[PDB]
Write an enzyme that holds these catalytic residues in place. Structure first.
Site, PDB file in Angstrom:
ATOM      1  N   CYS A   1      33.634  40.809  -8.610  1.00  0.00           N
ATOM      2  CA  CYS A   1      33.272  41.997  -9.397  1.00  0.00           C
ATOM      3  C   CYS A   1      32.928  41.563 -10.818  1.00  0.00           C
ATOM      4  CB  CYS A   1      34.408  43.032  -9.396  1.00  0.00           C
ATOM      5  SG  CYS A   1      34.104  44.579 -10.293  1.00  0.00           S
TER       6      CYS A   1
ATOM      7  N   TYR B   1      31.252  57.010 -11.248  1.00  0.00           N
ATOM      8  CA  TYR B   1      30.816  57.234  -9.883  1.00  0.00           C
ATOM      9  C   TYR B   1      29.789  58.346  -9.706  1.00  0.00           C
ATOM     10  CZ  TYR B   1      33.753  53.599  -8.199  1.00  0.00           C
ATOM     11  OH  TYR B   1      34.268  52.377  -7.918  1.00  0.00           O
TER      12      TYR B   1
ATOM     13  N   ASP C   1      27.876  49.750  -8.513  1.00  0.00           N
ATOM     14  CA  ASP C   1      29.231  50.037  -9.014  1.00  0.00           C
ATOM     15  C   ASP C   1      29.224  50.565 -10.438  1.00  0.00           C
ATOM     16  OD1 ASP C   1      31.977  50.322  -8.926  1.00  0.00           O
ATOM     17  OD2 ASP C   1      32.431  48.167  -9.164  1.00  0.00           O
ATOM     18  N   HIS C   2      29.861  51.710 -10.686  1.00  0.00           N
ATOM     19  CA  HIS C   2      30.013  52.261 -12.052  1.00  0.00           C
ATOM     20  C   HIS C   2      28.657  52.492 -12.732  1.00  0.00           C
ATOM     21  CE1 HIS C   2      34.257  51.345 -11.643  1.00  0.00           C
ATOM     22  NE2 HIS C   2      34.536  51.432 -12.932  1.00  0.00           N
TER      23      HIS C   2
ATOM     24  N   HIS D   1      30.403  43.304  -6.372  1.00  0.00           N
ATOM     25  CA  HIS D   1      30.086  44.406  -7.283  1.00  0.00           C
ATOM     26  C   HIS D   1      29.331  43.801  -8.459  1.00  0.00           C
ATOM     27  CE1 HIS D   1      33.138  46.060  -4.803  1.00  0.00           C
ATOM     28  NE2 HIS D   1      34.044  46.401  -5.699  1.00  0.00           N
TER      29      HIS D   1
ATOM     30  N   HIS E   1      39.924  42.181  -4.786  1.00  0.00           N
ATOM     31  CA  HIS E   1      39.332  42.688  -6.001  1.00  0.00           C
ATOM     32  C   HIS E   1      40.095  42.212  -7.248  1.00  0.00           C
ATOM     33  CE1 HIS E   1      36.618  45.853  -7.804  1.00  0.00           C
ATOM     34  NE2 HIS E   1      37.294  45.367  -8.830  1.00  0.00           N
TER      35      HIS E   1
END
Lengths: 349, 349
Positions: free
Chosen positions: A221, A309, A294-295, A250, A183
Site C-alpha cells: 500500500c 471512499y 484506493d482513497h 493499493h 496490509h
C-alpha cells in the site's frame, strides 16, 4: 507474464456507490470487498460470501480480493483464547478459497485501523481530503485494551503474537489456495502508546520470513509506507517484487516530510510518490495481481460519507493507472490487457 | 515539449462549473467560446475578456478557443461574404488582443457534426453517441431556409468549389492571425465523408496536405481530432498525426475514441482497447515530437446517472478521459527521459 486486473472497493448492498457505476469505469475488472454481517473474530459462512459474489458477477465483474477478514484484537493482543478466534479465521479462509477468491487482505494493527487528524483538510485546488497533522491534537489519550498494549505488550511481543498467527493460518491458506496479503500499519509508526510493526523494509523482510511462501505475501500500500519519509516505496516495492511477495496493490498518493502527512490526487506530481515508477516496476516484473486506486479527494458534490471512499476521484484514479500501465506495457513490447471482450453491442462488420 | 491538458467549458450557463473543472488532477487549460453574438457578426472584447476573467479567477487560463463559427454564406462562397469575413477578421483581432493563442474553427457545410443516436448502449451498460449509416438511410434532413441551403450545396457546390470557397476565406483571414499572434486550427469534418449528398473536404491525409498548403505557415493549422478521422476506417490517424507533426502543423489536439465499420461508428471510452485508436501511440508521437499546445479529452460516455444533455459533454467520462491522458503522457515522458509537468505549484496549502 504480466496480468494486472484493475479493481475497485465496494462495501456491498449498502454502498453509496453501485456496481452499475463501478462497471462503467473503463477497464475495471475486480471488486474488492468483504462480509459485513458477521462480528469481528467470528467466521464467515459460505452463503454470506456467495451472496456478494452472485451480485458482483451479475454486474459483469468478479471479486478478486476479499479486503479484510478482520483480526480479533484478542488474537493481536496474544490472549490465551486466541486459538478459538484463529480457528474461525481458518474457516473464513477455507470459505473464501471455496468461493474462488484468490487473495485475502488483512492488517495486524492494534485497536486502530488508521489514524487521521483532519477528514476535510483543504488542498491547493478546492477539493478536500484526509491528512495526519503530526502537530494538531496529537499527544492525547483517545477518549482496557489500550492500557494492556501500552503497559505490557512490546513490539517484539507483537512480532511473536503475529508469527503465532500466520503460523496457524498459512497451511489452511495453502490448501484453500488463498494468497494472504498483510496490509501495512497506517500511519506506519507508533502512535498513542500503541505499537506498530509492519512499517518498512526491514519489517516486510522479517514478516515474509515468518513463513516463506507466496501464500504469505504483503499488500503493497504505497501511500501508507510513504506516510513516513523514513520510507522509500520504490525500493520497498521492488525488494518485494524481486522476492515474489506482493499479492495486492493499493496505489494512493500522499505528501509528506517531517511535519506529518496528507493524501493527494493519485497523479505522481500531486504528492511524493512517483506512480509511474511504481507501475513501470509492476510491468518489468511481469506482476500478476490486482490494483485498487484506493482513497480519493472530495471533488465535485461528492456525497459519499465513508472517508476516502467516494467514487469520483477513485475512478479518476483507475483511468490514470490505465494510462500508466498501458504506456509502460507498450514501451516494453508487452501487450496490455484490460479485459474488454467487446467494443459494441448489436452493430459489427 | 509542454502539453497543457485542457477542458471545454460552455461559459456561465454550463452545469459543469470551473470549481469542478479545476479539481481534475493536472488540468490547466480551459477551452471556450462566446455565446451571445449571433454568429457571423463581430466578437466584442467586452465579451471575451469577461470569460477570461471568470476563468483566470478560478485558477485556470484560456488556452484555446473552441470555435468562432464561419458563416454559411462564407462557406457557400456567396457574394455578401466579405462583410462576414470582415467581422471574422476582427474576431481574430480581439482574441490575440487578450493573450489566447489558438482559434479552432471548421469548414463543414450545414452541420457541425451528425449523429444518429445520442444514447447508444455499450457493453459496459453505459451509453454514448453513435452514427449508424443504415439508420440514416431513410432520413431527409430557420427550418424552411436550411432546406434550400442544403439544396444549394447538393446542387451547385462541388467539393472543388468548397475547396475554393475555403481558399478565399483562408488567405483572407490568415495575415490577420499572424498579426494578432493567434493560431488557427481546423477541425476535421465529422463524419469525415459526405452524407445526405452534402460535400465534405476535410476528411483525410490528402485533405490535410492540401489544406496545410493553401498557406504554408505555422498559424494555418489543424485540430487533430483522432476520433473524427478514425470514424472512417480508410484513415490512418497514427500516420496522419505524425505527418502533421513533422510540419509543425498541429495547433490543438482532441483525443476522443471511436470504433468504426462499413456500418458507421460509435464513441467509446477514451481507453484504447475500448475503441480503434491506439491513444498511447498518439501521445507517444506528441511526446517524441516535443509538441506544444493544449490537448482536450473529448466526448465522454454517459455514466453515473449524468443528466447534462449536451452531446458528449458531461463532466464525468470527460474527466475520466483527462486523467487517463495524464497517465499516458507521464508514462511516456519518463519512457523517453524527458520530465512531465502539470498545473502543479504547491502539493499542499
Amino acid at each position: 507474464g504480466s496480468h494486472m486486473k484493475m479493481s475497485f472497493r465496494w462495501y456491498g448492498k449498502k454502498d453509496p456507490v453501485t456496481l452499475e457505476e463501478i462497471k462503467a469505469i473503463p477497464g475495471m475488472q475486480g471488486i474488492v470487498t468483504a462480509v459485513y454481517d458477521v462480528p469481528v473474530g467470528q467466521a464467515w459462512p459460505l452463503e454470506n460470501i456467495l451472496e456478494l459474489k452472485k451480485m458482483v458477477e451479475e454486474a459483469g465483474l468478479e471479486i478478486t480480493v476479499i479486503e479484510s477478514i478482520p483480526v480479533h484484537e484478542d488474537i493481536k493482543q496474544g490472549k490465551p483464547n486466541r486459538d478459538a478466534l484463529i480457528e474461525n479465521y481458518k474457516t473464513s479462509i477455507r470459505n473464501v478459497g471455496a468461493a474462488g477468491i484468490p487473495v485475502v487482505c488483512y492488517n495486524f494493527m492494534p485497536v486502530f485501523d488508521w489514524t487521521r487528524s483532519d477528514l476535510h483538510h483543504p488542498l491547493p485546488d478546492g477539493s478536500t481530503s484526509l491528512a495526519f497533522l503530526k502537530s494538531d491534537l496529537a499527544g492525547v489519550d483517545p477518549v482496557a485494551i489500550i492500557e494492556n498494549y501500552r503497559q505490557n505488550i512490546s513490539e517484539e511481543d507483537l512480532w511473536a503474537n503475529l508469527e503465532y498467527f500466520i503460523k496457524a493460518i498459512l497451511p489452511t491458506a495453502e490448501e484453500a489456495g488463498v494468497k494472504m496479503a498483510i496490509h501495512p500499519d497506517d500511519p506506519p509508526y507508533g502512535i498513542f502508546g500503541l505499537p506498530r510493526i509492519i512499517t518498512g523494509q526491514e519489517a516486510v523482510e522479517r514478516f515474509l520470513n515468518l513463513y516463506d511462501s507466496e501464500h504469505n505475501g504483503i499488500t503493497m500500500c504505497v501511500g501508507s509506507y510513504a506516510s513516513d519519509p523514513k520510507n522509500d516505496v520504490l525500493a520497498m516495492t521492488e525488494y518485494a517484487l524481486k522476492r515474489n511477495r506482493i499479492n495486492f496493490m493499493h496505489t494512493r498518493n500522499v505528501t509528506a516530510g517531517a511535519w506529518g502527512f496528507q493524501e493527494t490526487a493519485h497523479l505522481s506530481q500531486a504528492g511524493d510518490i512517483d506512480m509511474n515508477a511504481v507501475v513501470k516496476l509492476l510491468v518489468d516484473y511481469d506482476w500478476q495481481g490486482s490494483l485498487r486506486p484506493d482513497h480519493g479527494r472530495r471533488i465535485w458534490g461528492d456525497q459519499t460519507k465513508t472517508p476516502g471512499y467516494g467514487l469520483y476521484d477513485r475512478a479518476l484514479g483507475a483511468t490514470y493507472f490505465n494510462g500508466l500501465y498501458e504506456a509502460n506495457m507498450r514501451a516494453a513490447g508487452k501487450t496490455p490487457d484490460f479485459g474488454i471482450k467487446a467494443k459494441t453491442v448489436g452493430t459489427k462488420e
